[PDB]
Amino acid sequence: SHMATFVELSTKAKMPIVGLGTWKSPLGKVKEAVKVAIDAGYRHIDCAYVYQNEHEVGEAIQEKIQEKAVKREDLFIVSKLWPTFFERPLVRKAFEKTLKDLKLSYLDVYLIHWPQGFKSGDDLFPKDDKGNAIGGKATFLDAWEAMEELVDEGLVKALGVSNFSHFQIEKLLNKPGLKYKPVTNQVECHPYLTQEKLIQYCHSKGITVTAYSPLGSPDRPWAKPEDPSLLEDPKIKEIAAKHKKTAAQVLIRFHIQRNVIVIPKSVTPARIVENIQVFDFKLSDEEMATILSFNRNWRACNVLQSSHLEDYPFDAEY
């Protein structure tokens, strides 16, 4: 029924401009959510080892593949490497668990989830007696080298990064012996955090941008009632009303017209459909400029307060 526009990657592969986010999608609900999405015409699914629901995502994908509802080559599955797995043999292990869970033979994109290395071990969130993050020994550069092997072996079609600043991307691009370039940088983006300079930088380098938490992630555990709320913003809803659209649809279309890939999360069937019904209207030029003017450099996703460790991305201007 629906098809999201393609954004072409540096590799010539085709990335659908809208995908389904899966963070906080509870076990027992995410499987149906992905099926509804696939039926509606979603092809891009955003996943992560650290979301701990990848195996239910895999059940859904595998089912739909079996029913001939969709073919693997048309699906675009992205997952991410969590920083407790930066050491070379752990990279391979985390990737193998992710791939087994998703019941796939290959990933379309594999991302570095976060640039700072965290202490290897059982814990996904290693902390000290004051709850600060414990750093690890391998760097994201070490990790990338291991990931490049995945590409060589045909296990991953392309690599990318998430939550990187331009300084960190620069470091990657200038790394001696670089085999594969990042095809995307997945960062928080929305009208309260418009990311102009970083988007400009990435595009200038042939690196796409994927916008996460585009609805303001209202279901983030740490949300506080004083925090800004995009879905309730009256100017947003006013613009939505003009196009007989919802606020969510405007907040998604926003990224599309900046040529930014966007991955709204829902486990509600009606919303899943609604979130991909965004190729039948255009925001006016002044509507875009108005939405852009809402920037307040506000991050909904800043619970990682590992500002003491090396390579903390949010200290940089962009």
Ligand SMILES: NC(=O)c1ccc[n+]([C@@H]2O[C@H](COP(=O)([O-])OP(=O)(O)OC[C@H]3O[C@@H](n4cnc5c(N)ncnc54)[C@H](OP(=O)(O)O)[C@@H]3O)[C@@H](O)[C@H]2O)c1
């Ligand atoms: N790379 C990273 O570090 C990173 C970080 C955060 C997120 N991400 C990715 O980006 C995805 C999206 O971000 P997010 O999960 O933080 O938040 P989000 O997509 O901005 O917001 C999701 C919330 O919005 C609700 N919602 C969805 N569609 C709606 C609609 N049409 N109308 C009203 N409410 C709606 C959902 O409710 P229901 O689900 O109950 O319908 C859910 O509570 C994540 O799932 C994850 O895949 C990546």
Ligand SMILES: O=C(/C=C/c1ccc(O)c(O)c1)OCCc1ccccc1
């Ligand atoms: O719960 C979190 C982070 C959650 C999260 C979820 C989804 C994402 O896509 C993401 O980017 C982040 O962090 C907790 C704090 C922490 C982390 C590590 C070590 C010590 C302390």
